[PDB]
Symmetry: C3
Subunit: 23 residues, 3 copies
């Protein structure tokens, strides 16, 4: 929804995953 758009949620989730699972 618009919250996810306005807060860049998918981008941020993806980056977290890269750090967490990449480590």
């Amino acid at each position: 929804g618009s919250m996810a758009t306005n807060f860049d949620i998918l981008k941020r989730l993806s980056n977290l995953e890269k750090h967490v699972f990449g480590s």
Copy 2:
């Protein structure tokens, strides 16, 4: 809902603080 959205944002933001500091 605001509830779902607050949960998402709190959880995401806290993980960012933890992982990135």
Copy 3:
């Protein structure tokens, strides 16, 4: 879509904080 987000958050949290002794 908010559900894919919630699922990914729960998975992240488990990976970071869950015990690695649990299969």
